[PDB]
Amino acid sequence: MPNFSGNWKIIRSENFEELLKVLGVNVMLRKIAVAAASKPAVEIKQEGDTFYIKTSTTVRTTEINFKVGEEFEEQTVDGRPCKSLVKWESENKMVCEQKLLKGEGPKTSWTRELTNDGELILTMTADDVVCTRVYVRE
Ligand SMILES: CC(C)N1CCC(C)(C)c2cc(C#Cc3ccc(C(=O)O)cc3)ccc21
């Protein structure tokens, strides 16, 4: 019965500021984002391979809708419009490759995985730098 669906509570965050730095976010905006990202609300709805994911903070909210295997548009973690495509790497792990709509920048991606223990891992990557965030349902 359990899947990616849930209201998810963060329990661990690593390397978020480093990710924003590689993306070229300046010091003062990074400080704002890091603080706000420390207590996000995350809502996922899954129906088969169709997903809704809303990630909210006091300073910024993202809401994405996608089907695995079908291109969609969203934003990079630093706010730049991109084309995205999610695939199943494995049964419990989706991987999203991103391409900017305009300009150039680090190669970005994200992954979401349901681990053996019932928890969710999000990773966000820019070039070689990875941010890892772990959640449990509320
Ligand atoms: C200054 C501020 C408004 N600002 C401008 C710069 C920038 C776009 C980088 C930015 C990013 C965020 C974020 C985030 C976040 C990402 C993932 C999660 C998660 O999945 O848990 C939670 C939060 C917040 C503020 C913010």
UniProtKB/Swiss-Prot annotation:
Alphabetical keyword list = Cytoplasm, Endoplasmic reticulum, Isopeptide bond, Nucleus, Retinol-binding, Transport, Ubl conjugation, Vitamin A
- From what superkingdom does this record's organism come? Eukaryota
Keyword flag Nucleus: yes
Instruction: Please give the biological process terms from Gene Ontology that the record holds.
Output: embryonic forelimb morphogenesis; epidermis development; fatty acid transport; positive regulation of collateral sprouting; regulation of DNA-templated transcription; retinoic acid metabolic process; signal transduction
Cross-referenced PROSITE patterns: FABP
UniProt motif Nuclear localization signal: location = 21-31
Q: Which GO terms describe its cellular component?
A: cytoplasm; cytosol; endoplasmic reticulum; extracellular exosome; nucleoplasm; nucleus
At which positions is all-trans-retinoate bound?
A: 133-135
Q: What induces it?
A: By retinoic acid.
What SUPFAM superfamilies does the entry give?
A: Lipocalins
Locations listed in the record: Cytoplasm; Endoplasmic reticulum; Nucleus
Covalent crosslink: Glycyl lysine isopeptide (Lys-Gly) (interchain with G-Cter in SUMO): 102
Modifications the protein undergoes after translation, according to the UniProt entry: Sumoylated in response to retinoic acid binding, sumoylation is critical for dissociation from ER and subsequent nuclear translocation.
Q: Can you tell me which family this protein belongs to?
A: Belongs to the calycin superfamily. Fatty-acid binding protein (FABP) family.
Q: Which PANTHER family match?
A: FATTY ACID BINDING PROTEIN
Entry domain remark: Forms a beta-barrel structure that accommodates hydrophobic ligands in its interior.
What is the protein's known function? Transports retinoic acid to the nucleus. Regulates the access of retinoic acid to the nuclear retinoic acid receptors.
* Protein name, entry field: Cellular retinoic acid-binding protein 2
